[PDB]
Structures are given as structure tokens and as C-alpha cells.
Point group: C3
Chain length 193, copies 3
């Protein structure tokens, strides 16, 4: 079961969840809240490493991640990020989202973007109970044209699903959770497994 729009307006009013800044009524409809693109990005520098050993020694993996991740890219007023075909890039939502322990969220892209090949997640679209922060986007252009991405554009949508009860280990309280406090286009922390 997903919250319908009116109830998404209720839970937000009651402080039962937060979306900050709160999108206006034109962006909350059906069973979703549209979210917008942030202004921070990250690309990959493949020429500095041969591969990433996903569950290899913690040192080697971290040293490798730091080599291949560009610094954070902050776009000027007016400026675009050009996502070319076959290029993976990290980005972030403009909105911070905060979920309570008895709610899980789900990130969709958009059908208009799908029809041009833009994926807004790479089979990871769950926003956990107790989550609090801006959502990091993993963009991939699977289409035939480069796509200019500009801060503020509508980039996806969130839907919300009550859990069967409150989670006993929500994200804000789990010791080995990787992405609390995340505020920009944060790189993989697979090294922390």
C-alpha cells in the first residue's frame, strides 16, 4: 500500500515525514512527490586504476576509490552538466528527505526521461526508514543523445509505503550504515563493508 497524495500532504503536515524544501501542491499528486535535481556532481577518472575489488582489502579499495572519483563539481548560475551516452555520473536531489521508522520510500525516474534513455538509479531506489538526507543519484544515459541536466529540473518522484510496524533497526540508529549525514554527490563507500 502507498500513500495517496492527500495523505502525503497529511503526513507532511503532521511532521510524520519531511521533504525540505517542501514541494508545492502542483508537484504532489496520485501517489508521488516529484523531486528536483541538485547542483553537485561527480565523474570517474578511469585512467588511474585497472579495477575496483568490491570486497578486497579495505585499504586498497579506499585508495582506489579516491583515485577514480573526481572532486565534487558545483555548477555555476546558468550552467549545465552534459550527460553523454554510456557515461555514468553521480548527482544529488535538491530536496532532503526524512523518513520515520515505520515508513519506506521509493525513487522513480520519469517516463519523459526514460524515453530519452536517462536512468536516475542503478537498481538501488529504496529510501530506508529512519533515512535523513539528500538522495544521491546514480545517472546513466542509455540513449542516443547527450542530455543537458540543469539544477532545479524535475528529475524523479518518490512514493511512500507504511511498514507492518516500526522498524527496530532504522537507518539513523544502525552502526554500520554508510550514508547518514550525506549532503552532496557522495561516492560509493563499498570500502566500509
Amino acid at each position: 500500500m502507498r500513500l495517496c497524495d492527500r495523505d502525503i500532504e497529511a503526513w507532511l503536515d503532521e511532521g510524520r515525514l519531511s521533504i525540505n524544501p517542501r514541494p508545492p501542491v502542483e508537484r504532489i499528486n496520485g501517489a508521488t512527490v516529484d523531486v528536483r535535481l541538485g547542483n553537485k556532481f561527480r565523474t570517474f577518472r578511469g585512467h588511474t586504476a585497472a579495477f575496483i575489488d568490491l570486497s578486497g582489502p579495505k585499504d586498497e579499495v579506499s585508495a582506489a576509490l579516491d583515485r577514480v572519483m573526481s572532486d565534487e563539481i558545483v555548477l555555476d548560475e546558468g550552467e549545465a552538466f552534459y550527460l553523454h551516452p554510456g557515461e555514468l555520473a553521480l548527482a544529488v536531489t535538491l530536496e532532503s528527505v526524512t523518513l520515520p521508522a515505520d515508513l519506506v520510500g521509493w525513487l522513480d525516474g520519469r517516463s519523459s526521461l526514460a524515453r530519452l534513455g536517462l536512468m536516475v538509479h542503478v537498481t538501488a531506489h529504496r529510501i530506508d526508514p529512519g533515512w535523513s538526507g539528500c538522495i544521491v543519484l546514480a545517472f546513466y544515459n542509455s540513449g542516443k543523445l547527450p542530455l543537458a541536466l540543469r539544477p532545479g529540473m524535475l528529475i524523479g518522484a518518490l512514493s511512500f509505503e507504511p511498514l507492518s510496524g516500526p522498524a527496530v533497526r532504522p537507518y539513523n540508529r544502525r552502526e554500520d550504515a554508510k550514508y547518514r549525514n550525506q549532503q552532496g554527490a557522495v561516492a560509493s563507500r563499498i570500502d566500509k563493508d
Copy 2:
């Protein structure tokens, strides 16, 4: 919850939910209804533009979309569409689906297709409450072999999820909704943002 098969049917029998043509009992099972491939398609003509400015002047964006989108391709009797690796294409379901205001739908592909790299959407698989029309598919072949797609084949599945209450702004009543009355392989309408 999602509706189980008997409850999917019950909803079809009451007429709230509607699928046209209605698939037989052999294609409604577990918590899904199988859907089939239509006969309309669209490809991209990248050579006529440099890029698409997703958030750029409305006039630029439409003019560019019209140049890159092919003529609808209509396949007659057992003609195939050849989806080659790395090629994004648009297609449609054979079935029209109509949802009421208190229900949201979700499009899956198929495991058998996944194992050959066929994606049936590009992180956009929500069918909204109030939606009424054929579903546009954004195909991408991520595998190593070209795949021949024929009309009538089983291409995906739908599951259905009651909302917490009836949506106040369902898709059929919302004024800036892009894809009401969708009956073929309709191209992106990101220009109408």
C-alpha cells in the same frame, strides 16, 4: 499490499480496474498480470541534433525532439523489430490499462528477458491512479545478442497496489499531465515541462 491473482480478477469483474483486451486466467497469477508486445515502434535519428536540452527553451526542445524521433514503425503479420545491443527504442503494450483513483500499478519486465539483457523500462515503471491508455515501453538491449521482438509476445507484467485513499489529483484530472490518451509509441514530451 499488492493484489493477489483472485483479487486482481475481482477488481476486473467489478470494473474499477480495466485491462483491454482482458488476458485469460492463464496470464493472471500470483500477484501479476502478464502484458504483451504491441506493433508500434520508434527509433532515434541522432545525426540531426547535437543534444537535447532537457530544461531548455520550449521551442528548441520540441524542434529537436521532432527531428530525432523516427516515423512510427508499424509491423504487419509476423514481422520482427530487431533490438541490437546498445540501442534504445520505444514500443508499446498491446493492452490498454485503466486504473481508478485509489490504485497504482507497477510494470515489471521478465526474468527470461533480463537474462538476455532486455530492459522494458528505464527507471520509470509506475502506472498512475487515473491512468488510462496503452503503456509506452522504453526498451534497451544491455546484452550481447540482438533480439527479435514480435507483436503479441509476452513482454512484461503488472502488479497493483491499493492506495491509502482515493487520489485527489489522479492522472485523468491533472492539467499538466503529458500522456493521457496514449495509443502508440509516443515520444518523450519533456518539452511540456
Copy 3:
């Protein structure tokens, strides 16, 4: 509605849902159970066929699938599977999952893996009511770096959703279901449509 962590443990304790071997308490949190990577894999040999006719004559599609699928790869001690960008591969979960008729499951990847371009499904991530078996993974590396995959690593997550009632035609009792008794990195069986 998804089961929260305490409710997942309760259903495991009841036994009609089951995950063998059962992951410890550290791996069940929020609304998910983490799953791990198994030791069996498959690649494609494209050089033996021109294409696969998804709904062409049964005997010629079974012949083509047998020619393009490698036999099963079983990795030796401390050995890795190297997933190069743009290469599709099949794998399997370490865990066997068994769901009852009144429950559907959903496979996520991981945000840490998404941020390096690793997809763990190809728009097919529904685990059906009545399902029983190891889950076959369709991996694709959409990133810039090859990724070394080692058995035992955390590869994804499962969430669980009660159905409106028990399915009348769950997966275990359905005569044209393709993937019961599924043990390794089983190849597409699209030829059985």
C-alpha cells in the same frame, strides 16, 4: 505494505517464509534482508549466432540459446569474476528463498554498487509467491571500471510484501512456470513460452 525487520524475523521464526542459510540479525534491518553472491556464473558467446528470436520457432531458439550460453563457471579459492563495463553476465544468490502463497518479494541492488554502475537485475526483480530457490542475478556494469565480484559479498537486498490474500495460482503449482527447482546460474528459458 512491507514487512519491517521485526516482522521479517517473526515470519522466518513461523517458517512459511524461509531464507537458507538464514542471515544473522546484523543483515536484517529496516525493511530488508541483505543477500549475498554465490559461486556460479554464466557468460555469452556471441560469435556463434546472429540473434535470438524471442518468439520464434521453439527448437531453433533452444538451439541458439545453447550455442550462446557458456557452461557454468565455478570460481576456485580466492578467485574473482571480473565484470567489465558493457558486459552482461548471469550469477546467483548464495541464499535460497522460499515464499508462501500470500507473499511477494522484491530484489534491490545496493546504493554502494549503484554508485559504481553495477545493476543486479535487468528490470525483473519480483520474487513470486510460491517461489522456492536461489535467485538468478542478471548483472550489468554500466560504469567506467571493471568490478571484481567474489562469492560471499553483499550483493543485494530483499523486501517482502503481504498480498491481499493467498494466491490461487502461486509459482510452485503453475504448469508453465519456467524456474522452479532453480539451483545455479540458469540461462533464459524464453523458448518455453
